[PDB]
Amino acid sequence: ALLVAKSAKSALQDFNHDYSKSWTFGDKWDNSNTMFETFVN
């Protein structure tokens, strides 16, 4: 559910698989209910 726990877009998916997708479009990082509570941002 949370984007942080999603291991399938991490940097380990491109080094076990021989083929990976070259470019990227980024992400929309959140700090909602993580280990990174932040009051302002």
């Binding site: 491109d14 080094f15 076990n16 698989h17 021989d18 083929y19 990976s20």
Partner: protein, 51 residues
């Protein structure tokens, strides 16, 4: 009205008929019969799956 007729000239019309290609004409020297060339095909690179 009793003479055989006469021909005064002929002119031999000739045209010279170029090639439109012979800057393509390079010259080998008539030895051997088989020639060939070759390429290497592409290899798209691969990701580092360290597992």
């Amino acid at each position: 009205k009793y003479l055989f007729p006469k021909i005064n000239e002929t002119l031999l019309i000739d045209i010279a008929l170029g090639n439109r290609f012979n800057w393509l004409a390079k010259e080998q020297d008539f030895i051997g019969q088989y020639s060939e060339e070759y390429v290497i095909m592409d290899t798209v690179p691969i990701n580092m799956d360290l597992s």
